[PDB]
């Protein structure tokens, strides 16, 4: 990986002198503008495609291993604020996880001694960015600042209208929610945070604001204790169509463009994103699948797709896709897997039409109707006859006299019938067409093929032919299948 360190061969030497002009001993108050000598360098070296990340922290580390950081704390004592505006933007880009702890140790009060000064728009960006990445350190620093006004300023800056300021505000609240555990998520809506997020999610100007605001509200929706507090805020109704509206391909296009989101994230921030896939709320699953598909598209342009294996995110994707009743979430999961190059699982269903008497007896042992395995053996039922049992055979010759036992049997039979494998007998693939209407409808497909019909010949049925031949008893199901069939009228 020579290239990686050859970029350090282009980068690192500029610091030989660039550390010395801020280490310049004499200085002037006009000469403080020198701070910029680094700033171009760290932006430049940040945005090198596919090598950027590796050299970024590898350039930023020099100021803490050897001493540079101290100055940025010792120079904030200047009374006039051009210097603070100029140097907190440098302090932004150098703030990596190995550099957050040096400020977390000492530098806590240093930060909040200017976060109270909310009126300068030119400074409020930097204020918001430092407060954004300071949430990544730990639970304790989050609690110590939320005891301070460290949430009040970003909660107040939702009133403001500057765009990059609102970008940093949405990411600061997302990092606070995602790394603050469960104690601070009650302090958030206790300080009425979930209601001030609506102007950000209702923005019609920048898509990034919308996505990060939906991330923050979906992470606060996982807190059961405050769930109906956040459900009256009004933003959850914007979470479902938005992910339906946007696609993550154009989102990856718009995420490699901007500077601070160009390269992408790291493994620490993304292992904390996988638990949104299995969570209870639909919106948590849909937004987790959105990002982790967009993020796969981001880092598939480079050769770094091997990060999703070790973080334990392709197993969750691979088990979330099969047996899932959510077309949107499964679509995003399949796009992520087929983008990463892995195979997409298909369920393994029992082949009921080819069953014989031994398997029918074993299934009767399974469902708890073991008292009848003799009678079903005397009449010799197999899979094909089990799929075509009606009430009179159960009532007369199989011996089921109690009507409740027939109800408690058919419940189990129709639960088996939706999860069968008719591929050995379904030519035109009628089962998937029936499942796309409603997953409960898949159970009828053997009744449509035992008579013989298929998707090409489906358009010439009558309701009276569905009722007496195909075994559909519920009138709602007949009506819905008719109105889905008629719509394609002499279509082909």
């Amino acid at each position, epitope marked *: 990986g020579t290239e990686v360190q050859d970029a350090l061969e282009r980068a690192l030497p500029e610091l030989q002198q660039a550390l010395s002009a801020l280490k310049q001993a004499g200085g002037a108050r006009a000469v403080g503008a020198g701070l910029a000598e680094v700033f171009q360098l760290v932006e430049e070296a940040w945005l090198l495609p596919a090598v950027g990340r590796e050299v970024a922290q590898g350039l930023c580390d020099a100021i803490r291993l050897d001493g540079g950081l101290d100055l940025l704390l010792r120079l904030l004592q200047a009374p006039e604020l051009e210097t603070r505006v100029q140097a907190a933007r440098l302090l932004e880009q150098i703030l990596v996880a190995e550099n957050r702890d040096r400020v977390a140790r000492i530098g806590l009060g240093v930060i909040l001694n200017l976060a109270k000064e909310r009126e300068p728009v030119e400074l409020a960006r930097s204020v918001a960015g430092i407060l954004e990445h300071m949430f990544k350190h730990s639970e304790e620093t989050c609690q110590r600042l939320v005891a301070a006004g460290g949430l009040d300023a970003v909660l107040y800056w939702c009133r403001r209208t500057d765009p990059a300021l609102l970008r940093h505000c949405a990411l600061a609240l997302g990092n606070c929610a995602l790394h603050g555990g469960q104690a601070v998520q009650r302090r958030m809506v206790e300080k009425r945070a979930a209601e001030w997020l609506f102007p950000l999610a209702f923005s019609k100007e920048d898509e990034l604001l919308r996505l990060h605001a939906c991330l923050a509200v979906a992470v606060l929706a996982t807190n059961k204790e405050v769930e109906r507090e956040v459900e009256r805020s009004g933003t959850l109704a914007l979470v479902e169509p938005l992910v339906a509206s946007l696609d993550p391909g154009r989102f990856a296009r718009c995420l490699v463009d901007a500077s601070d989101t160009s390269q992408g994230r790291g493994p620490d921030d993304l292992q904390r994103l996988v638990p949104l896939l299995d969570s209870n709320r639909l919106e948590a699953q849909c937004i987790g699948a959105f990002y982790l598909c967009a993020e796969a598209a981001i880092k598939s342009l480079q050769g770094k797709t091997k990060v999703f294996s070790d973080i334990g995110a392709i197993q969750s994707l691979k088990r979330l896709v099969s*047996y899932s009743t959510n077309g949107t979430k499964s679509a995003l999961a399949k796009r992520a897997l087929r983008l990463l190059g892995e195979e997409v699982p298909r369920p393994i269903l029992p082949s009921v039409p080819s069953w014989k008497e031994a398997e029918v007896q*074993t*299934w009767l042992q399974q469902i708890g109707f073991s008292k009848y395995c003799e009678s079903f053996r005397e009449q010799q039922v197999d899979g094909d006859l089990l799929l075509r049992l009606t009430e009179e055979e159960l009532q007369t010759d199989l011996g089921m006299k109690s009507g409740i036992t027939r109800k408690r049997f058919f419940r189990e039979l129709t639960e088996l019938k939706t999860f069968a494998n008719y591929s050995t007998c379904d030519r035109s693939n009628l089962a998937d067409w029936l499942g796309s209407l409603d997953p409960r409808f898949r159970q009828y497909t053997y009744g449509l093929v035992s008579c013989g019909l298929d998707r090409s010949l489906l358009h010439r049925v009558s309701e009276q032919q569905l009722l007496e031949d195909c075994g559909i008893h519920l009138g709602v199901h007949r009506a819905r299948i008719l109105t889905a069939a008629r719509e394609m009228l002499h279509s082909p």
Partner: nanobody, 113 residues
Framework: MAVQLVESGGGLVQPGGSLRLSCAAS????????MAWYRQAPGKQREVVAV???????NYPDSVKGRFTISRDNAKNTVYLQMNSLKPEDTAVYYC??????WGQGTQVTVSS
């Protein structure tokens, strides 16, 4: 496809003792609809001991409520059956069953002094 299963465990336990069983499958367990275990006491016919379904719902016969627990482990491909309090009449050969057709070879379990 063909799903072949192997199961390990068993042997002898004192009455009022505990055992754990495994069942390794040739494919992923999260992929396959239903698994179950069966008890075949010598001289009688087979019966169910536990079933487990893809979402995680479990079902047991009334004779073994609380005395057995079945779980799915997805990191390594096994399903587990846990025996905790044992009776002398609970001796048999035990079978794993994937879906309703695939069988296993069974393991011997006896309980005495």
């Amino acid at each position: 496809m063909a799903v072949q299963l192997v199961e390990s465990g068993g042997g002898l336990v004192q009455p009022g003792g505990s055992l754990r069983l495994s069942c390794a499958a040739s494919v992923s367990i999260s992929r396959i609809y239903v698994m179950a275990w069966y008890r075949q006491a010598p001289g009688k016919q087979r019966e169910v001991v536990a079933v487990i379904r893809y979402d995680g719902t479990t079902n047991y016969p009334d004779s073994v409520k609380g005395r057995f627990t079945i779980s799915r482990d997805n990191a390594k491909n096994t399903v587990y059956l846990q025996m905790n309090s044992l009776k002398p009449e609970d001796t048999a050969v035990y079978y794993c069953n994937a879906n309703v057709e695939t069988w296993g070879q069974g393991t011997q379990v006896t309980v005495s002094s």
